[PDB]
Amino acid sequence: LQDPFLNALRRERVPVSIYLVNGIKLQGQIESFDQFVILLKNTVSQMVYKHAISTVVPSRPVS
Amino acid sequence: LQDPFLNALRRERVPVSIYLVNGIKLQGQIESFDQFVILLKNTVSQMVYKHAISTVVPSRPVS
Amino acid sequence: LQDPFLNALRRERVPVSIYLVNGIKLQGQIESFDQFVILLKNTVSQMVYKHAISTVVPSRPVS
Amino acid sequence: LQDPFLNALRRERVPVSIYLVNGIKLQGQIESFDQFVILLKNTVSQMVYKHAISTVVPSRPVS
Amino acid sequence: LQDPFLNALRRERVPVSIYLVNGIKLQGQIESFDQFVILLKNTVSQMVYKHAISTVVPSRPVS
Amino acid sequence: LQDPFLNALRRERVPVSIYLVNGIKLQGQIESFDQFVILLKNTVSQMVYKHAISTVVPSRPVS
């Protein structure tokens, strides 16, 4: 489920919110990902560990 | 235990609360799931990592 | 150790407190369990992920 | 390292503090343990998941 | 994705922020890393466990 | 990276701070370690689970 969901966000360059396990919300666009991290682009590319992610939320409906 | 419990919620489209490991409560309907994530539908589909889930709670009894 | 401890609680239908890793306390009776989840019955059955459990505490001595 | 450290506490029945990953302190005596849980005896036996333990601290020096 | 991202930061000795799963921000330069830890240099070398990292953020764009 | 870093601290008996995933700071000297725990000596030996450690920080430069 992960790969198609993440690929749709990446491909359509949709703004997303990534909530971390502490409740902090990161925003930006999904640049790339593997089974361990997601690169999230805003002003810089920041590397997010999936193990610290609770939920990924598109800013608008994404098929 | 997971798959039958989650499938019943999905199949009956019952509103559920998903509590995360930080105490945040997400609400909506179970769209689909695998061994790593749950897609939770409200206004958008958001992807929840199971490793960040503490408990899934049906809004009403579900056989 | 887990299986006998949990089975005794289930079999004797003793009220228990399940503390989560965030400090939240859930209460009810152990309905069933596997190596990943515990079903905890109060008004509904809710599915608790063991990875988010810190401690399970019987309301009274349980052999 | 775990097994000898925990066995010494168990064998000598020394009061210990078990701090959880949320900062909550549990107290009592080590009843038994495996690679997944520790049974901690105070008034009841409560089952503590090792994955939710940060540190185990003897109330006094223990060889 | 991890190794090239981390190597670029290390090689260019760029100041970074490492956010932990509790929200605490550590700052300094990436000295070295393996699949388990990152050594982060400020006044001393401190060893950060990757399992406690949520995100690594460069202070400026880094190719 | 872990073993040489931890061994240097142990061998030189340097005071260290061990920060846990909840932000609590433990202090003392590294007595011993394996892939699962670190024994941290202050007045008593306390056993710290590595999975609950975010960072280990020497009180002074340590080669």
PDB file of N, CA and C in Angstrom, chain D residues 23-45:
ATOM      1  N   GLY D  23       8.647   7.931  31.106  1.00  0.00           N
ATOM      2  CA  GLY D  23       9.106   8.573  32.320  1.00  0.00           C
ATOM      3  C   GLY D  23       8.411   8.074  33.581  1.00  0.00           C
ATOM      4  N   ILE D  24       7.369   7.266  33.424  1.00  0.00           N
ATOM      5  CA  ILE D  24       6.698   6.709  34.590  1.00  0.00           C
ATOM      6  C   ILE D  24       7.575   5.674  35.307  1.00  0.00           C
ATOM      7  N   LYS D  25       7.586   5.757  36.630  1.00  0.00           N
ATOM      8  CA  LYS D  25       8.384   4.873  37.449  1.00  0.00           C
ATOM      9  C   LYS D  25       7.507   3.818  38.102  1.00  0.00           C
ATOM     10  N   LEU D  26       7.828   2.554  37.839  1.00  0.00           N
ATOM     11  CA  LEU D  26       7.178   1.437  38.523  1.00  0.00           C
ATOM     12  C   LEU D  26       8.132   0.885  39.559  1.00  0.00           C
ATOM     13  N   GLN D  27       7.593   0.428  40.684  1.00  0.00           N
ATOM     14  CA  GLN D  27       8.421  -0.107  41.763  1.00  0.00           C
ATOM     15  C   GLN D  27       7.958  -1.482  42.166  1.00  0.00           C
ATOM     16  N   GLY D  28       8.902  -2.285  42.632  1.00  0.00           N
ATOM     17  CA  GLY D  28       8.574  -3.588  43.171  1.00  0.00           C
ATOM     18  C   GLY D  28       9.745  -4.538  43.052  1.00  0.00           C
ATOM     19  N   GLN D  29       9.431  -5.819  43.009  1.00  0.00           N
ATOM     20  CA  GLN D  29      10.477  -6.819  42.932  1.00  0.00           C
ATOM     21  C   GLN D  29      10.347  -7.642  41.663  1.00  0.00           C
ATOM     22  N   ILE D  30      11.494  -7.956  41.073  1.00  0.00           N
ATOM     23  CA  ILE D  30      11.543  -8.775  39.876  1.00  0.00           C
ATOM     24  C   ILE D  30      11.174 -10.217  40.180  1.00  0.00           C
ATOM     25  N   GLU D  31      10.026 -10.639  39.665  1.00  0.00           N
ATOM     26  CA  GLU D  31       9.485 -11.974  39.886  1.00  0.00           C
ATOM     27  C   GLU D  31      10.036 -12.958  38.866  1.00  0.00           C
ATOM     28  N   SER D  32      10.032 -12.549  37.603  1.00  0.00           N
ATOM     29  CA  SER D  32      10.610 -13.357  36.534  1.00  0.00           C
ATOM     30  C   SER D  32      10.680 -12.542  35.261  1.00  0.00           C
ATOM     31  N   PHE D  33      11.289 -13.109  34.230  1.00  0.00           N
ATOM     32  CA  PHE D  33      11.509 -12.362  33.006  1.00  0.00           C
ATOM     33  C   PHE D  33      11.844 -13.311  31.882  1.00  0.00           C
ATOM     34  N   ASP D  34      11.554 -12.891  30.655  1.00  0.00           N
ATOM     35  CA  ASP D  34      12.096 -13.548  29.482  1.00  0.00           C
ATOM     36  C   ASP D  34      12.633 -12.461  28.551  1.00  0.00           C
ATOM     37  N   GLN D  35      12.728 -12.735  27.262  1.00  0.00           N
ATOM     38  CA  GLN D  35      13.347 -11.743  26.382  1.00  0.00           C
ATOM     39  C   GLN D  35      12.355 -10.664  25.988  1.00  0.00           C
ATOM     40  N   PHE D  36      11.101 -10.825  26.398  1.00  0.00           N
ATOM     41  CA  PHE D  36      10.069  -9.880  26.005  1.00  0.00           C
ATOM     42  C   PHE D  36       9.476  -9.121  27.175  1.00  0.00           C
ATOM     43  N   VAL D  37       9.252  -9.796  28.300  1.00  0.00           N
ATOM     44  CA  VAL D  37       8.629  -9.126  29.431  1.00  0.00           C
ATOM     45  C   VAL D  37       9.370  -9.314  30.745  1.00  0.00           C
ATOM     46  N   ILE D  38       9.015  -8.471  31.702  1.00  0.00           N
ATOM     47  CA  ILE D  38       9.415  -8.644  33.086  1.00  0.00           C
ATOM     48  C   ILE D  38       8.148  -8.644  33.931  1.00  0.00           C
ATOM     49  N   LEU D  39       7.984  -9.652  34.788  1.00  0.00           N
ATOM     50  CA  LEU D  39       6.925  -9.630  35.790  1.00  0.00           C
ATOM     51  C   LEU D  39       7.436  -8.919  37.031  1.00  0.00           C
ATOM     52  N   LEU D  40       6.747  -7.848  37.407  1.00  0.00           N
ATOM     53  CA  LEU D  40       7.133  -6.996  38.532  1.00  0.00           C
ATOM     54  C   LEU D  40       6.116  -7.096  39.659  1.00  0.00           C
ATOM     55  N   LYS D  41       6.537  -7.617  40.806  1.00  0.00           N
ATOM     56  CA  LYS D  41       5.590  -7.859  41.886  1.00  0.00           C
ATOM     57  C   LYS D  41       5.551  -6.711  42.880  1.00  0.00           C
ATOM     58  N   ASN D  42       4.372  -6.129  43.050  1.00  0.00           N
ATOM     59  CA  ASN D  42       4.124  -5.319  44.229  1.00  0.00           C
ATOM     60  C   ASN D  42       2.941  -5.938  44.967  1.00  0.00           C
ATOM     61  N   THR D  43       1.760  -5.345  44.850  1.00  0.00           N
ATOM     62  CA  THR D  43       0.577  -5.953  45.447  1.00  0.00           C
ATOM     63  C   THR D  43       0.040  -7.029  44.506  1.00  0.00           C
ATOM     64  N   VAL D  44       0.122  -6.757  43.206  1.00  0.00           N
ATOM     65  CA  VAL D  44      -0.168  -7.760  42.191  1.00  0.00           C
ATOM     66  C   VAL D  44       1.073  -7.983  41.341  1.00  0.00           C
ATOM     67  N   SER D  45       1.052  -9.027  40.519  1.00  0.00           N
ATOM     68  CA  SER D  45       2.046  -9.199  39.469  1.00  0.00           C
ATOM     69  C   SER D  45       1.585  -8.406  38.262  1.00  0.00           C
TER      70      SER D  45
END
